[PDB]
């Protein structure tokens, strides 16, 4: 639902802000790059000044703000990506995280606790607070 995708994008950003983390991949970020048409010049939608703004916010991958209407859960070309990232009953979402340097160094292993902490502090104070956070992988 549109409400819990704001928290999903918040978690994705909070993980992407960890140090040696590059290329986080979520449903609100299906290729490590944010979804176009979701930043602030599109929540506001004469136009030739409000179109250049939206195009400057789409050319920069700016995703400080974010909204995805409830019109995307019935969009038939969105379900094949919605099944990859959310559980078949929607109760669990997953993020696919990549490192910068060597995942199996001494730093790529010290980043695991930091990923868990970032994802935990992202849901603090949100309706997803208290959810279980599982981090599998190879590091």
């Amino acid at each position: 639902n549109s409400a819990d995708f704001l928290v999903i994008n918040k978690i994705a950003k909070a993980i992407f802000a960890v140090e040696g983390i590059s290329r986080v991949q979520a449903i609100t970020r299906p290729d490590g790059k944010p979804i176009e048409h979701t930043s602030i010049p599109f929540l506001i939608s004469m136009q030739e000044d409000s179109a250049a703004m939206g195009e400057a916010f789409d050319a920069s991958r700016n995703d400080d703000s974010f909204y995805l209407p409830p019109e995307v859960f019935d969009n038939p070309d969105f379900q094949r990506g919605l099944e990859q990232f959310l559980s078949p009953d929607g109760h669990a979402v997953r993020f696919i995280i990549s490192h910068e340097g060597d995942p199996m160094s001494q730093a790529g292993i010290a980043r695991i606790a930091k990923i868990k902490t970032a994802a935990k502090e992202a849901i603090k104070g949100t309706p997803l607070e208290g959810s279980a956070i599982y981090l599998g992988g190879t590091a």
Binding site: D31, K33, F78, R80, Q84, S87, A92, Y134, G136
Partner: protein, 102 residues
């Protein structure tokens, strides 16, 4: 010989109590995709940007891979879907990959 019995009776690298093994089993179970830790990455690289013949061969490849139920438990396409396609492709477009859970 000792090596035959050692190869027959191989044991996991990580314990069942390892939080990462717990997490990986739970992630695989919740998403209905297997109960293992193994996963290979079929990379396909082209000397020139991957085109439509590349996508046709890749579709055939994932079809042949999914059909084997005995060893291939799942695979995340991410390239056969235009919404996520650029998430499985290099910046220059000469390489793509797909993760297969074993």
């Amino acid at each position: 010989q000792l090596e035959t019995v050692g190869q027959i009776q191989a044991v996991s690298m990580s314990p069942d109590a390892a939080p990462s093994m717990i997490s990986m089993k739970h992630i695989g179970k919740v998403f209905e995709e297997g109960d293992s830790d193994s996963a290979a990455m079929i990379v396909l690289e082209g000397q020139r940007p991957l085109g439509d013949a590349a996508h046709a061969f890749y579709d055939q490849m994932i079809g042949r891979l999914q059909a084997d139920t005995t060893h291939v438990q799942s695979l995340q396409d991410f390239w056969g879907d235009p919404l996520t396609a650029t998430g499985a492709q290099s910046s220059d477009g000469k390489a793509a990959y797909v993760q297969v859970k074993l």
